[PDB]
Amino acid sequence: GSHMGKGDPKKPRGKMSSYAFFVQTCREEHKKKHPDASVNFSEFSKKCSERWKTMSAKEKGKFEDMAKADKARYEREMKTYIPPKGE
Template sequence: MGRSRKDSSPQKRKIKDANRPKRSTSAYFYFLHDCREKAKETGAPTAKIGDFTKECSVKWNALTEVDKKPFLARAQTDKERYQKEMEAYTGKIKDVNKPKKPASSYFCFLAEFRIDMKGKNVDHKQMLSLAGEKWRGLNDGDKQKYIELAAIEHKKYEIAMEEYRRTGGKMAKGVNGVAIAPPVVVDEEEEDEEEDDEEEGEED
């Protein structure tokens, strides 16, 4: 007899803190905002939101790195704003030398899924939904690969943390001063948002 699923009862959503700083905006969302503004200026119909977003996604993927540079710069500035505001909000100053927590088996899967979905014109939310659906459909054998990857990442994290503590909080180094390969992590601007998705997509 199988165990009951986590979603057998109504899911409790986190209560949002009105004082929590607004998350940083990604380069793509800055581009999307510009597309909306240009559409308003020209009077061009934006049709359905989903169709409009898909059109913008196609344009974004067609941009060169040079064309994306202004949006990337704006995203970096907003990321720094978010980090400063979060430091003030939490009362903590972020330790940039402290190794980041390693990826779970689900996030190892998600990193691979992102690569497979690249260029398929799927927006962020939809991609996460598709990833969660595919993850839930994997059997234990299929998940074993990601469980093993997560174990490797956890080991790397333990080594990095041991070095971090040994050096009193300095950058973790490996043999002969070579930096230890960092664990697989999700981009910081998406990390908070995807923590909830992991709870929905991953089964214990």
């Protein structure tokens, strides 16, 4: 297990990648088909990952481009958020 230690700058660095954009899709599609069947991100991550790794450059390119657009919501945050100097 990864132990996280406090004292970090709390700097916004969390923008999702292509994989994540794929996993968020495959999930919602199934969640809409079954609104009463919990499709929790973590438990479905393994179902999407096996498909993600088996998709070609055509299918991945779609999720890449979109993942690039996610930086737009992280940039604005980091560009204005002034973190500690490591005190």
